[PDB]
TrEMBL record, chain A:
Residues reported in the UniProt entry to bind Zn(2+) 1: 519, 522
Residues in DNA-directed RNA polymerase subunit 2 hybrid-binding domain copies: 120-480
Subcellular location(s) of the protein: Nucleus
Coiled coil regions in record: none
Family, per entry: Belongs to the RNA polymerase beta chain family.
Transmembrane stretches, start-end: none
Protein name as annotated: DNA-directed RNA polymerase subunit beta
All residue ranges annotated as the RNA polymerase Rpb2 domain in the record: 1-42, 66-113
First-to-last residue of the parent protein present: 665 to 1203 of 1251
Protein function: RNA-dependent RNA polymerase that catalyzes the extension of a non-coding RNA (ncRNA) at the 3'-end using the four ribonucleoside triphosphates as substrates. An internal ncRNA sequence near the 3'-end serves as a template in a single-round Pol II-mediated RNA polymerization reaction. May decrease the stability of ncRNAs that repress Pol II-mediated gene transcription. DNA-dependent RNA polymerase catalyzes the transcription of DNA into RNA using the four ribonucleoside triphosphates as substrates.
UniProtKB/TrEMBL annotation, chain G:
Domain DNA-directed RNA polymerase RpoA/D/Rpb3-type: 17-248
Binding site for Zn(2+): 87, 89, 93, 95-96
Family note: Belongs to the archaeal Rpo3/eukaryotic RPB3 RNA polymerase subunit family.
Protein name: DNA-directed RNA polymerase II subunit RPB3
Residues of the full protein shown: 47 to 314 of 320
UniProtKB/TrEMBL annotation, chain I:
Positions that bind Zn(2+) 3: 22
Organism of this sequence: Sus scrofa
Residues that coordinate or bind Zn(2+) 4: 22, 24
Binding site for Zn(2+) 2: 8, 22
UniProt-recorded name of the protein: DNA-directed RNA polymerases I, II, and III subunit RPABC4
Disulfide bonds: 5-22, 5-25, 8-25, 22-25
One GO cellular component term: RNA polymerase II, core complex
GO terms classed as biological process: transcription by RNA polymerase II
Keyword check for Metal-binding: yes
Stated family: Belongs to the archaeal Rpo12/eukaryotic RPC10 RNA polymerase subunit family.
Protein task: DNA-dependent RNA polymerase catalyzes the transcription of DNA into RNA using the four ribonucleoside triphosphates as substrates. Common component of RNA polymerases I, II and III which synthesize ribosomal RNA precursors, mRNA precursors and many functional non-coding RNAs, and a small RNAs, such as 5S rRNA and tRNAs, respectively.
Amino-acid positions noted as binding Zn(2+) 5 in the UniProt annotation, renumbered to this chain: 24
TrEMBL record, chain J:
GO MF annotations in UniProt: DNA binding; DNA-directed RNA polymerase activity; protein dimerization activity
GO CC annotations on file: RNA polymerase II, core complex
UniProt-listed Pfam families: RNA_pol_L_2
Family: Belongs to the archaeal Rpo11/eukaryotic RPB11/RPC19 RNA polymerase subunit family.
Residue stretches spanning the membrane: none
Organism: Sus scrofa (Pig)
Record key words, sorted: DNA-directed RNA polymerase, Nucleus, Transcription
Signal sequence residues: none
Gene: POLR2J
Main location: nucleus
Subcellular location: Nucleus
GO biological process, one term: transcription by RNA polymerase II
Record InterPro entries: RBP11, RBP11-like, RBP11-like_dimer, RNA_pol_Rpb11_13-16kDa_CS, Rpo11-like
PROSITE patterns linked: RNA_POL_L_13KD (PS01154)
The protein's name: RNA polymerase II subunit J
Amino acid sequence: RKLRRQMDIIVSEVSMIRDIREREIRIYTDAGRICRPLLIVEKQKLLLKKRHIDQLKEREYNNYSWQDLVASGVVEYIDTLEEETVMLAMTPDDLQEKEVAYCSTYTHCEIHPSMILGVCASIIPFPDHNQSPRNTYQSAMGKQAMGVYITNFHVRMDTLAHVLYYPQKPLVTTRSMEYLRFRELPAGINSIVAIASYTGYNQEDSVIMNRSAVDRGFFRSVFYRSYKEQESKKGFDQEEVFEKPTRETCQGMRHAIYDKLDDDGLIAPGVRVSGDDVIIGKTVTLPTKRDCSTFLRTSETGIVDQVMVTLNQEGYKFCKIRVRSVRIPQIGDKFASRHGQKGTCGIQYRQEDMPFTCEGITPDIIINPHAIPSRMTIGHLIECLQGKVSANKGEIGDATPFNDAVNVQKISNLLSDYGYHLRGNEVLYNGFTGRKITSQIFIGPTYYQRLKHMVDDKIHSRARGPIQILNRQPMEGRSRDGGLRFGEMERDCQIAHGAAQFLRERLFEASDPYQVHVCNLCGIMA
Amino acid sequence: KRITTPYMTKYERARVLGTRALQIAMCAPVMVELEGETDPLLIAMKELKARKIPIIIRRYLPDGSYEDWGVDELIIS
Amino acid sequence: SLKQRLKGKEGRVRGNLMGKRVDFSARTVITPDPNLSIDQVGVPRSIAANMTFAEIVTPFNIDRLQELVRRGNSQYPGAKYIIRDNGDRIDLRFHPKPSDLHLQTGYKVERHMCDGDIVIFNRQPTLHKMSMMGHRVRILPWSTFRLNLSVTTPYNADFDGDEMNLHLPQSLETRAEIQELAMVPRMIVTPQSNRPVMGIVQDTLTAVRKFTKRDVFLERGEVMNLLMFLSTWDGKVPQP
Amino acid sequence: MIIPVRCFTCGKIVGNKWEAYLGLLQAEYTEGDALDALGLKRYCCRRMLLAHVDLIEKLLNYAPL
Amino acid sequence: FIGKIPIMLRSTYCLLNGLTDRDLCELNECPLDPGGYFIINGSEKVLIAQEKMATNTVYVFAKKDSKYAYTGECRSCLENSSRPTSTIWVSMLARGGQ
Amino acid sequence: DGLKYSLATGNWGDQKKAHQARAGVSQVLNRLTFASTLSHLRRLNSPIGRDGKLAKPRQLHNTLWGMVCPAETPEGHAVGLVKNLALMAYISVGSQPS
Amino acid sequence: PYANQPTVRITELTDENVKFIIENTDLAVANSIRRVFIAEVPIIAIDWVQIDANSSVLHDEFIAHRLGLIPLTSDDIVDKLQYSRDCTCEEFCPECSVEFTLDVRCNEDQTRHVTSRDLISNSPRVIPVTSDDILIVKLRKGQELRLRAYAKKGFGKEHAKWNPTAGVAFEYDPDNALRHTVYPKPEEWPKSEYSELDEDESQAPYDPNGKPERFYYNVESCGSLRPETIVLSALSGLKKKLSDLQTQLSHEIQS
Amino acid sequence: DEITPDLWQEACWIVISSYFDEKGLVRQQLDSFDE
Amino acid sequence: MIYICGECHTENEIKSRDPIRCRECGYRIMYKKRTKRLVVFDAR
Amino acid sequence: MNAPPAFESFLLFEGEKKITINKDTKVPNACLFTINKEDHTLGNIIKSQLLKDPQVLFAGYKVPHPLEHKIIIRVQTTPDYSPQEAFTNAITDLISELSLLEERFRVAIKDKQEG
Amino acid sequence: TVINNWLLIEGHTIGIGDSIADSKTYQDIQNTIKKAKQDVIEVIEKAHNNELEPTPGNTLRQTFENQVNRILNDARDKTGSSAQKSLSEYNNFKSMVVSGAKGSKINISQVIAVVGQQNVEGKRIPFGFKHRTLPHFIKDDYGPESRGFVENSYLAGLTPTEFFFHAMGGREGLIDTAVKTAETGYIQRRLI
RNA sequence: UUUUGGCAUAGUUGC
Ligand SMILES: [Mg+2]
Ligand SMILES: [Zn+2]
Ligand SMILES: [Zn+2]
Ligand SMILES: [Zn+2]
């Protein structure tokens, strides 16, 4: 342990584990083991002194680094096997301190408990005030949020990308975010939310948004698609070529417009296009010619944002085309808190229709109260309260999980200092009548994230479209078109109903009506 | 002596209304005086309440035999 | 192999006889709407403009279906196809010829789905009779399906982001069948455990619990404004 | 990325104050004092300048093309 | 010349190694892009850390559905050699013998 | 072309040995948010294997304190199998015992 | 059987906002008045936008959206102006529209700020309200931005960019004498700026025969219109709506 | 000399900031590939 | 038609049957010039 | 894509009447005024004004659906009075009140300006 | 329709103030918690001194586990009943639970007073390490927090150890839902 | 003057 803390012969990832009960010492210097730093404790005292922290404060213009703390033997890496042989301290401020001693032999102390959290779970404010299934839900959903995923996205040409117009760093944030770089690349908006029942479009985990706020750019995002295509001279039988085709030169074609393209067989950027248009005029020579041009996915519209032309690995001229499409929040778009409160936009109301406080403040979002009691996302309520306090105080609040100095009592006192109800409940007036709403309403800013799922991305119908080639059933190709699985459970449900003719129509007439002539003496098809 | 129930099952109601509505949609004569109706479904329901549909139900008994029933003979519920 | 083509769910028997893709269907996300009766379902304009029903030409609807044929696919409501008795299919987006649009009894127009039509609303998975139920079409001017707040608990679907399916019947026979067997009012009482399958739900249930308290009192104007929404009201204000 | 033109909730103009907010921060004003100096009382508007990240500075580093 | 090896982005043999953020902006690379992945056919492919049982370590388990009451196994494998990892089991039989 | 193949499709092992060659190592990088990219960079996958059917790994074990996030896993049939590193976690790169 | 006789008392008058009190009036009239404040006080906002050339880092519709939310001083011009869809013109004319032009060519390594100052109207009666000024977009060396826009008459109901008020504070019964709300613990609640309850009570005694009155307003303008102009145009527009409805009802009854 | 309880609450996060300044968040992949 | 070199911004025309290359840089990425068609935006 | 044209949330498209009257058959002297392209702004105020008149036995309004823009106002008066008469008197009272309020507001503006 | 249109006039919410009890209530809850902790210490030292005698048909570990389990159960139930007594008439939690439209009394006892004992497989948290649930505890410990009893409420906030043990508890429910979606309806798919 | 079009294993994601 001395030599590892001095790094003389032993690099500080080699783990040494002494099992006394078996009289064994196992030493592991192989790869694949996982470790974490831990502060070292001796005589029930930290080896980390204030002069070390002073040296850390001047990191720039000093060249004092973490590797000095590793070199001085104050913090050492410990692996899960060696953790078995450790009596660990959670926090030095109470546990190593003299008391009615729970234990009097602490070898190591943790730097901070919050580091047990994950990279996408560390963004949860007050995660220790929520049911842990909600923490898993938020960890899953935060990866699905919309935001500025990378600074150089303008130069990149990815398959699918989403960019939020006006991101905001959360008003309530854990200190770990400062090292996520999520404070510098936020994903979501701090929005005034009022947890209250209303006309009835927020129920069952839905949300009612301010139409006026959306008209001011609230949660407006852009969705970038990118298409790509290469030409080639494969053998001599065929040669695909970028050029706009015509019916007079291509004797096989699809019915659509082709004047958007230029003489190079490509569309100029800045042209507003629908799903049925052509973006790459490209055709193959028959062994006149026939089209194999590239259309847009036939469920959307957009603007061809950027067209790049280059050569592939072989050297054939190939082009990528990034298509922009603005997405305004609409009914059905999915929004989530940092606590698993996922909900679809139930309806949009203008500002005057929405409720409002005595100061004229209207809520950006309204969510059902009944989302709270079963889920028990109390971190959501404390986040709303702390956001209100931070916004009135003009200072970004703290959301470290196990910070003992912060609790709802002190937050309530701070809120009461600013002439508000200490619990955040407010009198609100109905927008349709102006009457005071009888019960008071809890309201305040909360960080919400537009998840990447929109209704136009996932919606389609089927009206006798491009059937299969093997069974003549509807197929999933060129679009979400292709009908829906009329699965065996649906058949069984209709057997329970007894709707035999409806089942016949769905299974036979509406899928693949066919007929065959068969002999009346043998079953052989005529 | 038809041993089966004198009531119309909901499935029989569904089939007879659907078939008579399709018949009316195929320019069949209407055995009741309509009152400005255009939907065949409503006209078929009016005929059923009037008990004036010419269909005869044939209930196949499980032993291969069958019973025949006029719609007006059955109890419409 | 030949055996591999039939075994499992993805074989021909389980994958293409007992269940399959079907034309005349749509699927999308649901959102709450308390202003709809339980038997009514709100649908986007696009799906109804695309999805269609076959109406047989009769001397009663000849004028209405003639006007629908005149409108064509461009506007809503309209039509896609004229199917004469000969079987020829005149597509109503490519033939602006009045010789092709002349109608008579026996023809079948593929008119766009409109309000009051019948649909089967469904959700993966189906676990009981109420997992597929008949609803009445309602055109609403947005891009998601709607549902009354009470028909959620039979379908087990909340408005978190789960989607639901809609199957449009095509013939008048099966349309009457869904009207008289599978509509939501007929499916209120489940035969599973001889009880109602649906009831009153979150905000409505808490609100009625607070409403029927002994000490609730309402002014004249509040009572009159509430009596507006009672569809089955006789029209007589009771004595206070 | 850029500052919004208006507060989403109430609609007061905020696009003529982000640069002034930075300038008053360089005067070592407390952030609450800075927002009070710019006439932002309702916390709807204070949220805007307190929580906005101006990524446009990091985006102009690339070539103009 | 024997072949071409993919290079993890921002690794010690990547061109972006040790450059300043301004130089990355000259190359149109985000300074906050963490790298640590590969570019294959232009697509950004990233490796997921594969968990497996450790090697060279005796482990005593109980195969309840076996003729053995217990089993002491060891996945022995050389360091940087013999990728075939020879797994030995030495097991005490149960007393249900014939 | 071998390494390019094995990163191009996710199959890991010889191309003709794809019958039993374990796959699902190299994946398209999750580029939707910065946090999503980070979470995909640090992801660790446990294969099902023959050992998964003897001991149930889906449950969160106590030894994952401070090394793996207690609540971060895909909600589905992969609960527990796919995990992510704790923030201060660091994985041994290996050194010689000599 | 006739409407009340309202009395007005302007407590505070400023050029960005105004605060007043309406007494002897019904609740519904006050609610409709604030609804008209937000919804149906028309102003002029840049709506139509042609991009002659863009080279900024931000795509075009982002710039158009930003230009939409720029407020414009339309104190008197909005009255004589008319809705474009109502006026008879090819696309635009002074009777129903105002042309704007913008062109900034940054060829300087120092950062450039395309602000509201750079907007150039063809009539001085309408300008950006700031003319510090609103930032529209930052530009680098080598980036141009050239465009021509048109601003037209509209009101907040059609789109929030035509919303003239930056928030309308409303209040009535500050002492909760009517008990329209039920404080579970009235001791915890702050007093309004109009409440006369001293700091030993929390609610006035419950008046049974009371009625809503003494409606307090604080109308905050964005500066597109003066606040007194906003209130006057609000009342004028609501009167116009009711007179039109009376005309249609008379035609209906005569028919 | 030793860190007081009031100062520890910021000293620990200064230590963590120094850690992430030194090593970063993708140390595992980079170090493994270099090795 | 006209294309912009992706490195040195060299505007240059390229035929339909010649591989692309910057006429003063040798760079091998080209971007199409902006469309000269009328584009308009409602500010909503 | 199915987002409605917002400008057709207050404009009568062709073949649409601003207001229509339907005499309800359940109760005598009961009428239903269906007004298109309107909202709570006129409905609430007209409801209150009709409630002011003692001769109006019952007065109320509803919106059948918020996305649509019909408003249906039910009015029932005594059997010596037309509901249309009550509606017209209510509109005249509101217009007179708002004109009086405009005059008094201009006077108050002038007073605060001089003061 | 009528109930929603009235609810506009009435209105319904849920707030932080709805999750606050009296200081006397918190004091009584803490007294009960310290009582339960001391009782569990008494049972632990009795078992240590070989003074706990096993019940018939049960080993000593089973007897000790059942005793401490029921001690924590009745302590949790007493704290929950005390929390239920402290609720007001305007408490929106009580509005939503009495109506039965969402939540339950157990949920109110969890949010306000005591989250309660976590469980895996129907037992307390096992010794993943040798004779230890986590490194922060001493070897051969059977106290409530050492074996995974959460003592704080959600509003009070979980400790790191209690937070991790509750994450372990919820992982069991997520596994249950996963194997549900695996095996649900295969029974039905054969039955039909 | 009428449009078509692939199968596959693997991966991720959503109730
Ligand atoms: Mg769901
Ligand atoms: Zn604001
Ligand atoms: Zn004109
Ligand atoms: Zn060049």
